[PDB]
Structures are given as C-alpha cells and as structure tokens.
Amino acid sequence: MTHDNKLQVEAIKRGTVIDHIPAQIGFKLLSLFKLTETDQRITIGLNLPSGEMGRKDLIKIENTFLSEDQVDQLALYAPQATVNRIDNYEVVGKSRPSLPERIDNVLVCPNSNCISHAEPVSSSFAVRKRANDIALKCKYCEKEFSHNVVLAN
Amino acid sequence: MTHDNKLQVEAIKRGTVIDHIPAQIGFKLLSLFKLTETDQRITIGLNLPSGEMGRKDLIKIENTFLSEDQVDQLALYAPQATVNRIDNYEVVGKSRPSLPERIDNVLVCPNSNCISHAEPVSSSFAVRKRANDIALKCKYCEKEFSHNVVLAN
Amino acid sequence: ANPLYQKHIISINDLSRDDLNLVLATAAKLKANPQPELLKHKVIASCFFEASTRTRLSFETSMHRLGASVVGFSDSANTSLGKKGETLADTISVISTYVDAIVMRHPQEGAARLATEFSGNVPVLNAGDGSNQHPTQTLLDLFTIQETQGRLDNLHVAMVGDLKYGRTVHSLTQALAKFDGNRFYFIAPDALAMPQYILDMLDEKGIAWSLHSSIEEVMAEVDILYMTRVQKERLDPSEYANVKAQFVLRASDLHNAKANMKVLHPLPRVDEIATDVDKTPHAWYFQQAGNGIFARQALLALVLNRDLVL
Amino acid sequence: ANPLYQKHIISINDLSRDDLNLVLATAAKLKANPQPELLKHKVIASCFFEASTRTRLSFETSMHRLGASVVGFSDSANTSLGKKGETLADTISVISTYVDAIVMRHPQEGAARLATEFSGNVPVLNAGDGSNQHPTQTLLDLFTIQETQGRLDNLHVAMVGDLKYGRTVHSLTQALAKFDGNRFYFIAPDALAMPQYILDMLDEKGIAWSLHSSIEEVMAEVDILYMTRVQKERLDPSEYANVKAQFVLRASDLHNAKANMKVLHPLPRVDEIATDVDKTPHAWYFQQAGNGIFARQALLALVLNRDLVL
Amino acid sequence: ANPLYQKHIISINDLSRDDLNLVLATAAKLKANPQPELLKHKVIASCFFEASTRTRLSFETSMHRLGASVVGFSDSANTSLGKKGETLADTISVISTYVDAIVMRHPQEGAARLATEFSGNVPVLNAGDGSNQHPTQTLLDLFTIQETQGRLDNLHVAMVGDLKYGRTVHSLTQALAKFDGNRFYFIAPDALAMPQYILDMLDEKGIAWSLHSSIEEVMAEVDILYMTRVQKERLDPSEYANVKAQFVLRASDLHNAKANMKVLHPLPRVDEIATDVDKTPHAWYFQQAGNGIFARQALLALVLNRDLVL
Ligand SMILES: O=C(O)C[C@H](NC(=O)CP(=O)(O)O)C(=O)O
Ligand SMILES: O=C(O)C[C@H](NC(=O)CP(=O)(O)O)C(=O)O
Ligand SMILES: O=C(O)C[C@H](NC(=O)CP(=O)(O)O)C(=O)O
Ligand SMILES: [Zn+2]
Ligand SMILES: [Zn+2]
C-alpha cells in the first residue's frame, strides 16, 4: 500500500491517478473529461505543493482507467502530467501522455467560414508540435491554429 | 480532527469544510460558485461513503472563509450541506445554509431580451422557495425562472 | 416630503396601496384645481427609445401643464446610443447630469431598473420597458376605473388579448390585486397566456381568477372589459399565428352587458375593437387615454415636489 | 455689451484667451448663482443634421435653464433639406428669420462658417461641423480641466485615439495652445494622426509635443488623459483597418498615474476605456459632461445677453 | 488502373509529384491527340455554389470535348439548398446517386472534403472551396509554367497580391514546393500575407522564400510573376483597406525582366495588371486560361477512365 509520509494524498485501491497536472488545469480536465459524471469515488487536490513543479493539481478516480477517455487529449492541456494505473494500493502502471496525430469531436474549428459548422460532421484536427505552442490543422478547412486559439475558443 | 475512524481524510487547519453535499452536487457548487479560482489548497472528495446520505461530496478550502451570505447561497443547490470553519485544526464554527432572499453576480438571466446582458451590471435574482424547485426572479426583467434552468457565468 | 418624493417609479410590484391611492388622490385634486407653475424651474427628460404616441405626448403635455421644460428624443436613431454604439448605462450617466427627472420607454425589459443604477438621485420613471411593466399606464387605468366604477375593490375585471407580452396587463393586474375582492377573467390564446408569476401572485393573495375561451361567457358579469392589442413587435417567430386578433369585440356583443360596464384599452388598437363600439355608452378607451394627463401630472408632482398638492 | 455679445462661435481659432476665460468666468458665476429668467423671451433653434446625445441635450437643457424656448430638429430627414433637396444656405436664410440664435451640428465641415454668411445678425453657434471644430465641447473641457487641475497653463496633456478626425481634440489643442507652457502627448495610429496644421501651429508658438506608441509611456507625467473614440462615421474606406480602438485604458494601467490626474473623454466611448475605470478616482468623463451645462449656459448668456452676468 | 482512377481531387497537399506529373503528361497527350469519345457515356455534375467563369466553362467544355454530358447549376439560388434550406450533405447524398462525378466550387472552405464523406464512390473534384484550395487551377498553372519555362524545378517564382485568401497561391505554392530548388518571392500587404502553414511547410522542406514590398525588387530574378486579385468577397470588415490593388503591374515595370519570364494570373483581374501589359510578350494569363482545357481534360480522363491515355 501507500501510507502518509509527509504527503497528505496517497491512498486508493485500483483506479487511475493523474499526477503533475498544472495549476488551474485540474478543474478543466474534470470538466472536459466529464470525470465527475460517475458514482465512483474521486479525490481531487488543487494547488498541492509540488517539490516537482511548485504547485500541482492531482486527481484520483477509483475503478476507472482513462485509456479510452483519451490520454491523447490530456497530452494537450497537461503535457507534463503523469498517469498511473493503480491496483492493490500499488502503482502497477505509469506513463506520460503522448501527443496524438489527430483529435476528433472534442474541438471546434476557429475558422468561422469552415464547412464544419453548418454540417452533420464531427470535428478533427491534425496535431503537430512547434515550440511550446502546438498547432492544429482543421481536417476540412485545412486552416491551422494554435491550441491556445482552439482550446481557448 | 479525526483518528479513530474509517474515513480517509485528514490534516487541515484554518479553512472551510463544506460537508454533506448531495452526490452529483459537489462538482456543481465548485463550478457554479467559482470555488476553484484561487491560489489556495483545495481538497475535494466526490462520492465519499456516507452514513445516512449513502454517498456524499466533500469540499475543503484552506485559508478561506465563506460569509453567512455565501454559505446561504449553497442552499440553492445543497440544502443539506453543513459548513465548518477551521483554524489551528480546531473546528471553531459550524453552521447550515438558509435560503437567501437574493443571489447576486452568480447566475445569468435566461431572458434574451433582459437588459442585463450587453450592460455594465451584475446579475441578481430574488429567491423564492417553490414546490419541487426554487423560483428566481430577475431584478431587471422581473421574469421568474426555475433554478434548474438558470445558468452560471 | 410625501412618500413618493424623489422615488423611482419602475414597477407596480414595488409600490404599495397607499402610494397608488396617493397618486389617485392627487390626480383628482390637480384635475379640480390646476397648478400651472408647480414644476416651474424643472427640466425633465422624455427619452423614448421605442415608439409611443399616447404615453410620450401625454407625459410631455403633463409636464407643460405644470410648468416644466422638456428635452429628449422620440427615437434612439438620432442619439449616439444607436448612431455610435452606446450602452444605456452611459446614456443615463450623462443625461442624469442635465435633468431633474427622466421619463423613459425602452425595447428591452429591465431598462428602467438599470437606469436607476446610473442616475444618482435623479428619479427614473418607467414609460414602458419592453413587455415587462408600464407603471403610469396603470395609474391612468386605476383613475379611470375608479371614476366610472366608484371604486377599485370587489370588481369583476376581464382582460382580453395578448396577456403574455402585455406590459399593461402585468402592471394593472398587480395593482388591482392590491385591492380587496377583485375577480379576474383572462381571455387569451394559449400561446399568449398571462405569465405564471402573475397567476402565482394572485393565488398567494387568495384572489379569484379564471380562464375563458370567449368574451360572451363573461360579458354579463364584468364591470371592466380590458382589451389589449397583440404585441407583434415582441412576439417570437413561433407565435406569428397569434399576430391577428383572435377575440374581436363588436357593438352587438354588449347587449347583455352591465349598465355600468366600461370597455378599456391602452390605445393602439388593430381590429380587437370594432369602430361601431366607439359610439356605445360602454366605449371608454379615449376618455381613458384622457385620464393619462391627470394621473401623470400627479405622478410628476409627487416625485418632484416635496409638499403634497393642496 | 460684453465682448461676445452677438458673436458667432465657429472655431476656437477665432477666439482669444480673453474670450475663453470670459466664458469660464461666466460659467462659474451661473453655476454658483443660477438665473432662471436671463433669456426669458428668446427662441433658439437647435438644428442637428447629424447624431448627438450629449451636445444637443445639454445645450437644450441650458436654454431652458436660462428661460429660453427651443425649436428645431435632431435629424435632417424630416426637414425639407433632405426630403426635398435643399441647400444649407436656404435652410439658414429662413431659419434665421424665425429665431434669436442658431445652434447647429452638421456632417460637412464648414457648415457653421457657411451659416454665418446667411443668418443676418442672428448668431450661429457651431455644435460640431464634421471632423473640424467643436468649440463648445472645448469650453466644457477647459472648464473641467481648470476645475480639476486648478489651472490651464503648464499642464501635461495626453490625447489618445483618432486625432485626425477628432473635432474635439482639434479645438481643445488650439485652445490649450493659447495658454502658457502646456505640453502635449499624442498617442494615435499613423492612419489617424493629429493633422499637420495643428502641429505646425504648436511649432510656431514653441509648444512642446511628442508622439508615443503607448499610454504606459506617458502615464506617469500626464495631468489630463484625454481619450477619444474612432470617428468611424468619417473614416475613408482605406482606413477601416483602424475602426477598432487601438489603445484601451483599463484600471490597472492607472497604477503609476499622478494623484491629480483625470481621465476625460467626449462621450460616446466604445471599448477604449474599460468600465472598471469608471470606479477609479481618475475617471471624470461623466462629470466632464455635467459641466457641459455650465459652459453652454455661459456661452448662450454671453452671446444673447448684453450685460455681463453678476 | 492509373493512380488517379476514382480518386477525389480535393487538395494539392494530398497529391504526390508523380500524380501532378501524371496529369501534365496526360494533358500533353490529349492536347496533341484529342479523344472525343473517351467519356462517351458519362454524366458529370457541374455544381457551382459560388460565382465563376473560367473554371466552370473550361471544365464543362473539357467534358464535352471528351464526350461526357453535364448537368448542374451555377448559382445555389435555384437549388433546394438555398430556396428551401438544405445541408451540403443532403445535396451531395442525392446528386451522387445521379452522376458519374462531381465538380464543385463552394463559398465555405472544407466543402469538397465534406462532400467526399457523402458521395459513395462518386469522385469529387474541388473547383475551389472558399479561399482554401483550388487543385485544378494549379494543374493548369503547372502545365503553363512548364510550357514556357521548360521545367518545374529551379525556378524563381513571385506571387503578388492577396496571398491570405488566395486559394490559388495556396495550392500552387504547395505544388511547386514538391519539386526541386524553387525560390519564392512573396509580395503582398501585411494584412493579406501568405498563411503561416505554407511558410512552415516551406521551411520544413528547406525551400528558400522571402518577402518584398515591391515588384521592382524581384523583377529581374523572376521566371514567373504570378499576380492575383484581392479576394474582396472573403475579406473581413477590418481588411477593407486592402480591397484596392496595392501592387500594380505596368508595361514599363518589365524593362529589366528576363526574356523567358511570363506574367500569370488566375484571370479575374481588377487593375492589378494594366491592360498595356497585354501587348507585351510577358503577358500569358489568357494563354494560361486556355491551358485549362488541357489540364482539366487530363484530370477527368484519369479520374473517370481506368486505362491510361495512349
Ligand atoms: O401598445 C399597446 O398595445 C399597449 C401600451 N400602449 C401605450 O402605452 C400607448 P403608446 O404606445 O401610444 O404610448 C404599451 O404597452 O405600450
Ligand atoms: O462623438 C465623439 O466621439 C466626440 C464628440 N461627441 C460629442 O460632442 C458628444 P455627442 O455626440 O453625444 O453630442 C463629437 O465630435 O461629436
Ligand atoms: O482569381 C481570382 O480572383 C479567383 C479565382 N478565379 C478563377 O479560378 C477563375 P473563375 O472564377 O472564373 O473560375 C478563384 O479563386 O477561383
Ligand atoms: Zn475548419
Ligand atoms: Zn432578466
């Protein structure tokens, strides 16, 4: 198991633990991923002292693994975040979210003249890394924007 | 202040603890009242085991004190909630929400023709306990709305 | 200082029975004994950002009859609020530094209330705020009902037409509900029914009200038949079927009508009342509009003048 | 007869420092001791062929405050000049045979001037002529500046926004240039920079002036921060790139501002002054507008009343 | 089956070099030896939801030259998409059950790509999707450049004018960047510059490109001077200053122009090229359009015909 050693947040039995979430980002993920829409126990810690980063957000969800809940997407909002799969109170799996080639449904193309708006289709953007500013190319209008213009739509 | 219990929460001094939040409500209070837009340490537990409520949400906010008018606003969404003020680990104060007369600068008038929109003013509604819901009367347009329809922001 | 001195006149919901009676008592006094110089050195703003014929002219006439000056606009198209994009807060912020009181009519509901938040101690009078309230119209209507009916209590009042978007009926129902024993009969399409907050309010006071599909049903019980026009300029696309008048009063429908009964109507009419009604003893919408002068003179007098009219 | 008796008030460029101080002096006297009947039997034409909220209402209010009557229009769409094709000369040839003074605002520059060539001894007062001059706006500004800074000389004045088309900054600049040691800071987009004629004029008098790309730069030296709105209704097609405010003042930008500093702004504003600024002690555009009443009363009194106000 | 058989021609970005060359080699073959019945029993939809002269007519003429039939509309005002409100999806769902191929030009970007998801195995050819792509136009440009420069690699290409909304330069730049050693000179106003995604792409390929404020600068190094029109119908209100041509080409500006250099231009021109240039040997925009017949005949042939043209 994992007891308390000057770390006031270490206890759960089988589930997902999203660590290293940047401050002011933990509440976003909770929203986008609809993580709270569940009957499972969730523990959330915001503005936690991080010798690692400085101040971090932390989330723990029991009996819930985020593999199809898009770690993909998570790669965008919390690049440095770490996802650990827990079982028997111990970290059996650990990983870093890796940038996807694309993102579908979730996002909305900034381009106001893009055909995507008035039609029966799901969004889709090709992800590409530049410099602390991920660029997104709309599948339809082919125009490109920064994740800061698309995510903060 | 807890030791001889089965609960998994511990160590907090000088802050606020909102308890007995009905399930699926803890997240609403959190977003609906901008409770996470702070630099202070926050600890939330959703779907925590509850003796009587069966299940419950739990919010703890260090170095923050909700006034009597704020605690009463909670009554619109979590009447059963219980509030304890903390300091030096001592739970000095304890209280309960009581339905307010008004709730300002929190919700947005559903009325598309309500003057409050494109104007330098903060929303405001008269709160009226009704059967099965709560009626909210815009201080501007004077239309009444179901608290289950009035949005945030 | 009388109770309404320097007070905002926004919604009937915010006035008491005493306040109303005071206006009516004053309106009667001034009607019997005019006072051409009561508001002698006053300058009042008449700000209509929406159309009006009766309210604005009667209000400005009332001001002149009391000796006050008038400045304003009858169309927000020449103002910088429209021709230059300007918030109402800013418009009220500057106009309130010029005048002694502001009379305003606006397309959006809540407009008048908002104005009070930007006019430090300059009174704001709601000349109508987009389908919500119409305080002065009510004062005019009460004055008329008391004149023809002898009282304002234990009356049978029926309201026909657009009750949903009828700011006149919202104010009038709330005021009459401040008097004892009145019974209401609401006759309107389903799509344009009286607001639930109005009905709930009536239930809370133990006021009796009931719905009806026609005027013939109640024609023989009513003391006041209050007709209204369909508020087309405020209807939503999915309601345009109501644009036309579904209930039309004709001279013949008054055959089994109480001798004392009067037909009232805020004045813009579009076939809800046949012109053959104009000649009957029951037609009372013009003398009603006429009472707008005395109700409004009294209102201006009580709000701008500290000492009650002798 | 005081010096401005029966004089046309067209451009600040034709007034002396004497005339300005005269108006301010009178404005202060009328503010402290009103004279409700000074213009008792005068009828003044308020002719606005172009939009206006503050200028037309405070002028008209001022006329009533002095006991004069008002006639006119706030839109040239009802006049026979628009609905019947008429030259301004003709419109003035007739209107000047009806009234005692003509206050006018027109979309074309020079209108006020032109008017004087057609109003036989009937004084014309320019209420704004296109993107040229706005004399009484300046008077209100000088009054406000003297009120808050205690003087009109040796001040640091910044003018931000559209300076090419701001008829207000043109007048104000030329007027402040009539006083000693004033220093100017122009913060405007290249496409809307202060006209060359103003600058050559400041040079000729040895007045110091500098251009700046931000408000932050000058925010520590300025006494008066004069914000202006982009005159969208006057821009040329090739300048629509500027229609949006390029300089936005927020309450956070005032952290290093002098205690005495005051933010002014003629008023229709549009996002170039955050409303959070309104709460700060530096915001002073609404009060600025309040003084429009005293400045205009004085101007009317000096122009239409022969003896100086006591 | 050739590489382009039954494939959608949506974006140059999805086409290889082998594909582009395949098209040009076919155009030359058909230009040399016509094949009047190659598409004898085919019916192709010509759907223009946006205006057009050269693209639609050349495309429709190409079809006839190959024996295919054409159906469609050149204005979405007669279709059920506009006169009855219909999604592009439903429009394509039905048209694709009628025809053998769909050539479409749309006002919104992404339209062609959207269309492919609704036309089960019925090829979609993008005739331009609002400011995004224009594949065929590029095939025509490639053909012409090759015809006059003898090659598609190691060329100095300058593109002048609206480069942000120029769907032609977006495709052309991407296509020429698929060949070796081409150098780009971009001459366009700041507000209408070449989109970042094209620049980043050029960098990724190590392609050389530079910006310039005039044509004169690059006039002596360019092999191709690709002029463009300002996409006035796609400009945003805050860009109307660019509606006029900032760069004008005149017969004289070509005095120091390379012998081989050719002036091109997707023809709708609005004074970006003075008519006096028409006479010079450098003008080549009318012959360019003419090449549309060959590039488009080859495209249709490859898409609707399995066996390569002999
Ligand atoms: O217009 C109506 O139907 C009723 C009522 N009417 C009036 O006030 C008369 P007017 O619009 O001429 O002032 C109103 O709500 O504005
Ligand atoms: O409108 C402006 O931006 C400045 C100035 N404004 C005013 O004088 C106020 P108004 O247009 O309301 O009379 C003007 O030039 O007319
Ligand atoms: O060159 C232009 O201005 C527009 C350009 N034009 C053409 O392709 C020629 P057309 O519009 O006649 O088909 C386009 O984007 O489609
Ligand atoms: Zn898009
Ligand atoms: Zn409202």
PDB file of N, CA and C in Angstrom, chain A residues 4 8-9 11-12 24 27 30-31 36-49 55 62 89, chain B residues 8 10-12 24 27 30-32 35-49 55 62:
ATOM      1  N   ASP A   4       0.985   7.619   4.717  1.00  0.00           N
ATOM      2  CA  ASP A   4       1.342   9.034   4.738  1.00  0.00           C
ATOM      3  C   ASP A   4       2.749   9.323   5.253  1.00  0.00           C
ATOM      4  N   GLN A   8       0.188  14.297   2.279  1.00  0.00           N
ATOM      5  CA  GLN A   8      -1.224  14.168   2.627  1.00  0.00           C
ATOM      6  C   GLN A   8      -2.191  13.653   1.561  1.00  0.00           C
ATOM      7  N   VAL A   9      -1.673  13.032   0.506  1.00  0.00           N
ATOM      8  CA  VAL A   9      -2.538  12.497  -0.545  1.00  0.00           C
ATOM      9  C   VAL A   9      -1.925  11.247  -1.176  1.00  0.00           C
ATOM     10  N   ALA A  11      -3.566   7.365  -1.155  1.00  0.00           N
ATOM     11  CA  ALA A  11      -4.421   6.250  -0.749  1.00  0.00           C
ATOM     12  C   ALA A  11      -5.577   6.000  -1.713  1.00  0.00           C
ATOM     13  N   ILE A  12      -5.650   4.778  -2.234  1.00  0.00           N
ATOM     14  CA  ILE A  12      -6.703   4.376  -3.164  1.00  0.00           C
ATOM     15  C   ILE A  12      -6.506   2.908  -3.538  1.00  0.00           C
ATOM     16  N   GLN A  24      -4.524  25.341 -11.958  1.00  0.00           N
ATOM     17  CA  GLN A  24      -5.621  25.874 -12.754  1.00  0.00           C
ATOM     18  C   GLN A  24      -6.001  24.983 -13.934  1.00  0.00           C
ATOM     19  N   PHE A  27      -9.172  21.462 -12.745  1.00  0.00           N
ATOM     20  CA  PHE A  27     -10.611  21.667 -12.852  1.00  0.00           C
ATOM     21  C   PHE A  27     -11.089  21.588 -14.304  1.00  0.00           C
ATOM     22  N   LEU A  30     -11.388  17.822 -15.328  1.00  0.00           N
ATOM     23  CA  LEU A  30     -12.534  17.296 -14.600  1.00  0.00           C
ATOM     24  C   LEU A  30     -13.782  17.594 -15.431  1.00  0.00           C
ATOM     25  N   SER A  31     -13.785  18.771 -16.044  1.00  0.00           N
ATOM     26  CA  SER A  31     -14.898  19.213 -16.867  1.00  0.00           C
ATOM     27  C   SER A  31     -14.940  18.541 -18.240  1.00  0.00           C
ATOM     28  N   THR A  36     -16.397  13.657 -13.313  1.00  0.00           N
ATOM     29  CA  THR A  36     -17.248  13.559 -12.132  1.00  0.00           C
ATOM     30  C   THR A  36     -18.610  12.920 -12.379  1.00  0.00           C
ATOM     31  N   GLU A  37     -18.976  12.781 -13.650  1.00  0.00           N
ATOM     32  CA  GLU A  37     -20.247  12.161 -14.008  1.00  0.00           C
ATOM     33  C   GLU A  37     -20.030  10.665 -13.800  1.00  0.00           C
ATOM     34  N   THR A  38     -20.136  10.242 -12.545  1.00  0.00           N
ATOM     35  CA  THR A  38     -19.907   8.855 -12.179  1.00  0.00           C
ATOM     36  C   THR A  38     -20.339   8.642 -10.735  1.00  0.00           C
ATOM     37  N   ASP A  39     -20.481   7.382 -10.343  1.00  0.00           N
ATOM     38  CA  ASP A  39     -20.878   7.048  -8.982  1.00  0.00           C
ATOM     39  C   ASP A  39     -19.658   6.567  -8.208  1.00  0.00           C
ATOM     40  N   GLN A  40     -18.510   6.552  -8.887  1.00  0.00           N
ATOM     41  CA  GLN A  40     -17.239   6.122  -8.299  1.00  0.00           C
ATOM     42  C   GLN A  40     -16.615   7.210  -7.437  1.00  0.00           C
ATOM     43  N   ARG A  41     -15.777   6.816  -6.482  1.00  0.00           N
ATOM     44  CA  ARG A  41     -15.130   7.781  -5.602  1.00  0.00           C
ATOM     45  C   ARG A  41     -13.988   8.524  -6.285  1.00  0.00           C
ATOM     46  N   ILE A  42     -14.004   9.842  -6.170  1.00  0.00           N
ATOM     47  CA  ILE A  42     -12.976  10.670  -6.771  1.00  0.00           C
ATOM     48  C   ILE A  42     -12.398  11.555  -5.697  1.00  0.00           C
ATOM     49  N   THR A  43     -11.088  11.708  -5.731  1.00  0.00           N
ATOM     50  CA  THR A  43     -10.389  12.549  -4.785  1.00  0.00           C
ATOM     51  C   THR A  43      -9.655  13.530  -5.658  1.00  0.00           C
ATOM     52  N   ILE A  44      -9.742  14.810  -5.323  1.00  0.00           N
ATOM     53  CA  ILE A  44      -9.086  15.835  -6.120  1.00  0.00           C
ATOM     54  C   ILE A  44      -8.334  16.771  -5.207  1.00  0.00           C
ATOM     55  N   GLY A  45      -7.110  17.105  -5.588  1.00  0.00           N
ATOM     56  CA  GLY A  45      -6.313  18.020  -4.794  1.00  0.00           C
ATOM     57  C   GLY A  45      -5.828  19.129  -5.701  1.00  0.00           C
ATOM     58  N   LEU A  46      -6.219  20.367  -5.416  1.00  0.00           N
ATOM     59  CA  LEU A  46      -5.804  21.509  -6.235  1.00  0.00           C
ATOM     60  C   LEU A  46      -4.779  22.349  -5.494  1.00  0.00           C
ATOM     61  N   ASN A  47      -3.833  22.916  -6.239  1.00  0.00           N
ATOM     62  CA  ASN A  47      -2.794  23.745  -5.643  1.00  0.00           C
ATOM     63  C   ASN A  47      -2.013  22.987  -4.577  1.00  0.00           C
ATOM     64  N   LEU A  48      -1.575  21.775  -4.907  1.00  0.00           N
ATOM     65  CA  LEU A  48      -0.802  20.978  -3.966  1.00  0.00           C
ATOM     66  C   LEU A  48       0.668  21.355  -4.102  1.00  0.00           C
ATOM     67  N   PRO A  49       1.383  21.480  -2.971  1.00  0.00           N
ATOM     68  CA  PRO A  49       2.803  21.835  -3.027  1.00  0.00           C
ATOM     69  C   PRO A  49       3.541  20.745  -3.787  1.00  0.00           C
ATOM     70  N   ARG A  55       3.548  23.947  -7.676  1.00  0.00           N
ATOM     71  CA  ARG A  55       2.146  23.851  -7.271  1.00  0.00           C
ATOM     72  C   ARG A  55       1.464  22.974  -8.322  1.00  0.00           C
ATOM     73  N   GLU A  62     -11.344   6.009  -8.568  1.00  0.00           N
ATOM     74  CA  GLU A  62     -11.378   4.569  -8.331  1.00  0.00           C
ATOM     75  C   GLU A  62     -12.070   3.736  -9.408  1.00  0.00           C
ATOM     76  N   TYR A  89      -3.572  -0.990  -4.132  1.00  0.00           N
ATOM     77  CA  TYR A  89      -2.919   0.145  -3.492  1.00  0.00           C
ATOM     78  C   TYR A  89      -1.509   0.403  -4.013  1.00  0.00           C
TER      79      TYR A  89
ATOM     80  N   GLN B   8     -10.955   8.393   5.103  1.00  0.00           N
ATOM     81  CA  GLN B   8      -9.623   8.572   4.543  1.00  0.00           C
ATOM     82  C   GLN B   8      -9.206  10.027   4.350  1.00  0.00           C
ATOM     83  N   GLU B  10      -7.713  13.596   6.286  1.00  0.00           N
ATOM     84  CA  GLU B  10      -7.008  14.067   7.477  1.00  0.00           C
ATOM     85  C   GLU B  10      -5.999  15.189   7.237  1.00  0.00           C
ATOM     86  N   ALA B  11      -5.750  15.957   8.296  1.00  0.00           N
ATOM     87  CA  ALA B  11      -4.787  17.055   8.294  1.00  0.00           C
ATOM     88  C   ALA B  11      -5.178  18.330   7.548  1.00  0.00           C
ATOM     89  N   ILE B  12      -5.857  19.232   8.253  1.00  0.00           N
ATOM     90  CA  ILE B  12      -6.263  20.515   7.694  1.00  0.00           C
ATOM     91  C   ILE B  12      -6.484  21.508   8.823  1.00  0.00           C
ATOM     92  N   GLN B  24     -23.302  14.292  -6.849  1.00  0.00           N
ATOM     93  CA  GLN B  24     -23.532  14.979  -8.119  1.00  0.00           C
ATOM     94  C   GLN B  24     -23.814  16.470  -7.943  1.00  0.00           C
ATOM     95  N   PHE B  27     -19.596  18.915  -7.530  1.00  0.00           N
ATOM     96  CA  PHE B  27     -18.956  19.486  -8.703  1.00  0.00           C
ATOM     97  C   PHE B  27     -19.671  20.743  -9.213  1.00  0.00           C
ATOM     98  N   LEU B  30     -18.797  23.686  -7.014  1.00  0.00           N
ATOM     99  CA  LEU B  30     -17.425  24.010  -7.347  1.00  0.00           C
ATOM    100  C   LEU B  30     -17.343  24.917  -8.571  1.00  0.00           C
ATOM    101  N   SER B  31     -18.054  24.559  -9.636  1.00  0.00           N
ATOM    102  CA  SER B  31     -18.031  25.361 -10.850  1.00  0.00           C
ATOM    103  C   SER B  31     -18.987  26.537 -10.774  1.00  0.00           C
ATOM    104  N   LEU B  32     -20.193  26.285 -10.291  1.00  0.00           N
ATOM    105  CA  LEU B  32     -21.207  27.329 -10.198  1.00  0.00           C
ATOM    106  C   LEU B  32     -20.827  28.522  -9.317  1.00  0.00           C
ATOM    107  N   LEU B  35     -15.427  28.292  -7.020  1.00  0.00           N
ATOM    108  CA  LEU B  35     -14.682  27.921  -5.817  1.00  0.00           C
ATOM    109  C   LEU B  35     -13.256  27.447  -6.051  1.00  0.00           C
ATOM    110  N   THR B  36     -12.891  27.185  -7.305  1.00  0.00           N
ATOM    111  CA  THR B  36     -11.543  26.714  -7.609  1.00  0.00           C
ATOM    112  C   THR B  36     -10.679  27.777  -8.280  1.00  0.00           C
ATOM    113  N   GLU B  37     -11.192  29.001  -8.359  1.00  0.00           N
ATOM    114  CA  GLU B  37     -10.421  30.097  -8.936  1.00  0.00           C
ATOM    115  C   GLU B  37      -9.725  30.777  -7.760  1.00  0.00           C
ATOM    116  N   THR B  38      -8.728  30.093  -7.217  1.00  0.00           N
ATOM    117  CA  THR B  38      -7.980  30.595  -6.082  1.00  0.00           C
ATOM    118  C   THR B  38      -6.587  29.986  -6.132  1.00  0.00           C
ATOM    119  N   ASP B  39      -5.680  30.511  -5.314  1.00  0.00           N
ATOM    120  CA  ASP B  39      -4.319  30.000  -5.246  1.00  0.00           C
ATOM    121  C   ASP B  39      -4.213  29.125  -4.011  1.00  0.00           C
ATOM    122  N   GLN B  40      -5.314  29.017  -3.283  1.00  0.00           N
ATOM    123  CA  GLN B  40      -5.332  28.221  -2.071  1.00  0.00           C
ATOM    124  C   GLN B  40      -5.539  26.728  -2.316  1.00  0.00           C
ATOM    125  N   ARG B  41      -4.961  25.936  -1.421  1.00  0.00           N
ATOM    126  CA  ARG B  41      -5.019  24.481  -1.459  1.00  0.00           C
ATOM    127  C   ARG B  41      -6.469  23.998  -1.331  1.00  0.00           C
ATOM    128  N   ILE B  42      -6.902  23.144  -2.256  1.00  0.00           N
ATOM    129  CA  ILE B  42      -8.261  22.619  -2.229  1.00  0.00           C
ATOM    130  C   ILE B  42      -8.248  21.096  -2.206  1.00  0.00           C
ATOM    131  N   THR B  43      -9.148  20.525  -1.418  1.00  0.00           N
ATOM    132  CA  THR B  43      -9.246  19.083  -1.277  1.00  0.00           C
ATOM    133  C   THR B  43     -10.698  18.685  -1.459  1.00  0.00           C
ATOM    134  N   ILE B  44     -10.981  17.919  -2.504  1.00  0.00           N
ATOM    135  CA  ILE B  44     -12.347  17.505  -2.780  1.00  0.00           C
ATOM    136  C   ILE B  44     -12.477  15.988  -2.841  1.00  0.00           C
ATOM    137  N   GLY B  45     -13.592  15.490  -2.325  1.00  0.00           N
ATOM    138  CA  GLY B  45     -13.866  14.072  -2.352  1.00  0.00           C
ATOM    139  C   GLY B  45     -15.271  13.895  -2.895  1.00  0.00           C
ATOM    140  N   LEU B  46     -15.410  13.252  -4.052  1.00  0.00           N
ATOM    141  CA  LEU B  46     -16.727  13.033  -4.649  1.00  0.00           C
ATOM    142  C   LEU B  46     -17.142  11.581  -4.467  1.00  0.00           C
ATOM    143  N   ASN B  47     -18.414  11.364  -4.149  1.00  0.00           N
ATOM    144  CA  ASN B  47     -18.926  10.018  -3.949  1.00  0.00           C
ATOM    145  C   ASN B  47     -18.237   9.319  -2.774  1.00  0.00           C
ATOM    146  N   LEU B  48     -18.070  10.061  -1.683  1.00  0.00           N
ATOM    147  CA  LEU B  48     -17.469   9.525  -0.465  1.00  0.00           C
ATOM    148  C   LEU B  48     -18.554   8.764   0.306  1.00  0.00           C
ATOM    149  N   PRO B  49     -18.176   7.687   1.013  1.00  0.00           N
ATOM    150  CA  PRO B  49     -19.154   6.909   1.774  1.00  0.00           C
ATOM    151  C   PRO B  49     -19.864   7.811   2.764  1.00  0.00           C
ATOM    152  N   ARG B  55     -24.168   8.378   0.019  1.00  0.00           N
ATOM    153  CA  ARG B  55     -22.978   8.900  -0.654  1.00  0.00           C
ATOM    154  C   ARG B  55     -22.970  10.419  -0.485  1.00  0.00           C
ATOM    155  N   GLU B  62      -8.471  25.608   2.193  1.00  0.00           N
ATOM    156  CA  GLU B  62      -7.611  26.247   3.186  1.00  0.00           C
ATOM    157  C   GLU B  62      -7.529  27.770   3.055  1.00  0.00           C
TER     158      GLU B  62
END
